[PDB]
Amino acid sequence: RKSIRIQRGPGRAFVTIG
């Protein structure tokens, strides 16, 4: 699994990739 700290909202957060 992988995740990224996106510069989008709501607010800076970590989303998963796949």
TrEMBL record:
Listed transmembrane segments: none
Source species, domain of life: Viruses
- Its predominant location is virion
The answer to whether keyword Glycoprotein applies is yes
Q: What is this protein called?
A: Envelope protein
The entry's keywords: Disulfide bond, Fusion of virus membrane with host membrane, Glycoprotein, Host-virus interaction, Membrane, Viral attachment to host cell, Viral envelope protein, Viral penetration into host cytoplasm, Virion, Virus entry into host cell
Please name the taxonomic classification of the source: Viruses, Riboviria, Pararnavirae, Artverviricota, Revtraviricetes
One CC-aspect GO term: virion membrane
Q: Where in the cell is it found?
A: Virion membrane
BP term (GO), one: symbiont entry into host cell
